[PDB]
Amino acid sequence: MIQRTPKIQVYSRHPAENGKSNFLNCYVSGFHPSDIEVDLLKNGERIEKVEHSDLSFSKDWSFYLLYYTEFTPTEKDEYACRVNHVTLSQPKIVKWDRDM
Amino acid sequence: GSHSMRYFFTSVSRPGRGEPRFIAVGYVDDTQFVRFDSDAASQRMEPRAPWIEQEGPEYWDGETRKVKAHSQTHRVDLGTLRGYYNQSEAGSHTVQRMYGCDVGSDWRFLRGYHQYAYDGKDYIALKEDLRSWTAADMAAQTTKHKWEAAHVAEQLRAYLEGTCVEWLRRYLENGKETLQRTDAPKTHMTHHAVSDHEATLRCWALSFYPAEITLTWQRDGEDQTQDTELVETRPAGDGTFQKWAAVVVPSGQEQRYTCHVQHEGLPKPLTLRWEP
Amino acid sequence: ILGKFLHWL
């Protein structure tokens, strides 16, 4: 039995422009085992309608998943991704950066 | 040139509450086309690409019969492995399986695969000859002996060399327009001052397919990997992919660095520079 | 298309 902590990326589907509809993504990968909790946040609050790809895995057997939701970036709104996994003793929050 | 078809299966035990989670997923190349989830209401193999929707009811019935069978074998495999490794019922475990074939540009058979993993560690694998097995330890060797007597390798060879290929071609001809497309990455560069003495240059590749790609940095035309950062290639949610590569550099020396990008859609690779 | 596989570890 081995455990690999997830890598996390937060990003938009298309380059961001304030006031243009887009998609916010949280890609979690390289993790094991498969159970994982991922939320997208807006100003610290959980967004309820988020979709996700079907569970799949890489050559090393580690899993990956894509969570996503429609959004419209703005000057001051703050979006993030919060993740929990056996490997983490507390949820990890990754803020979205327009340029990573 | 080459193409692949790949099926992936994951079962997870749930000591508390009933049967294991089973999730199965099929790809050609980097495009998911099918899925099953033991927890979904439909209890059916579901399409996940437009071009597979054409296939008729017999197809979905056949595929559904078979994914269910696969999940049953996994259900029992979990029990079997708890026995082999002498583990308690407490605690959740994971069995994974993948199999598939590759073909070359001519679309002739190139290579086959079939492997299992237990709790994220290689358990047993069909060897490239498709005749023989690699078995990790005593437990896997038991399985190997069972499979040798049950002629499983023959069963797999017949699928991997024949059916797997014949259907891969069929798929590549339906939804030709999605699977045989190549979308060259759209590229650009950004600059950020890290400190008074240095800067990062980040090289972007966007909107590309398929996922294979290479981003490389040079200084005065010499390959550099010192002080570089790559990110794992990642899905935009729309069938395409993204990646960036960054390097930190002394400030004032940006002109000496170039980023080189290679992809199926760029027979002659691109190079990029910071335009001040 | 899936393999017609009834295989047990």
Structural overview:
Chain B: A peptide antigen 1 binds at residues 7, 73, 84, 143, 146, 159, 171. Chain B: This is HLA class I histocompatibility antigen, A alpha chain. The complex is a heterotrimer of chains A (100), B (276) and C (9). Chain A is 0% helix and 47% strand. Chain A is mostly beta strands and 100 residues long. Chain A has one domain: Immunoglobulins (Immunoglobulin-like), CATH 2.60.40. In chain B, the strands form three sheets. An eight-stranded antiparallel β-sheet of chain B has the order 4-3-2-1-5-6-7-8, with helices on one face. In chain B, strands 9, 10, 13, 14 and 15 form a five-stranded antiparallel β-sheet that branches. In chain B, a hairpin with a 2-residue loop joins β2 (21-28) and β3. Chain C is low in regular secondary structure. Classes of the chains: A mainly beta (100), B alpha+beta (276), C little secondary structure (9). Chains B and C meet through α1, α2 and α3 of B and loops of C.
Principal-axis shape of chain A equals elongated
Report the portion of residues of chain B in β strands. Answer: 35-45%
Beta-strand content bin of chain A: over 45%
| CATH C-level name of chain A | Mainly Beta
- The residue fraction in helices of chain A comes out at under 10%
CATH superfamily of chain A: Immunoglobulins
PDB class: immune system
Keywords: HLA A02, hlaa, MHC, Immuno, Telomerase, immune system
Assembly: trimeric
Entry title: Human Leukocyte Antigen A02 presenting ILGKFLHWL
Quick rundown:
The complex is a heterotrimer of chains A (100), B (276) and C (9). Chain B is an alpha+beta fold.
Q: Main traits of this protein?
A:
heterotrimer, A: mainly beta, Immunoglobulin-like, five-stranded antiparallel beta sheet, four-stranded antiparallel beta sheet, elongated, C: 9 residues, little secondary structure
Blueprint (SSEs and pairs):
The complex is a heterotrimer of chains A (100), B (276) and C (9).
Chain A: E1 7-12, E2 22-31, E3 37-42, E4 45-46, E5 51-52, E6 56-57, E7 63-71, E8 79-84, E9 92-95
Antiparallel strand pairs in A: 1-2, 2-7, 3-4, 3-8, 5-7, 6-7, 8-9
Chain B: E1 3-12, E2 21-28, E3 31-37, E4 46-47, H1 57-84, E5 94-103, E6 109-118, E7 121-126, E8 133-135, H2 138-149, H3 152-173, H4 176-179, E9 186-193, E10 198-208, E11 214-219, E12 222-224, E13 228-230, E14 234-235, E15 241-250, E16 257-262, E17 270-272
Antiparallel strand pairs in B: 1-2, 1-5, 2-3, 3-4, 5-6, 6-7, 7-8, 9-10, 10-15, 11-12, 11-16, 13-15, 14-15, 16-17
Chain C: no helix or strand
Glycosylation sites (chain B): 86
Protein name (chain B): HLA class I histocompatibility antigen, A alpha chain
Domain Ig-like C1-type (chain B): 185-271
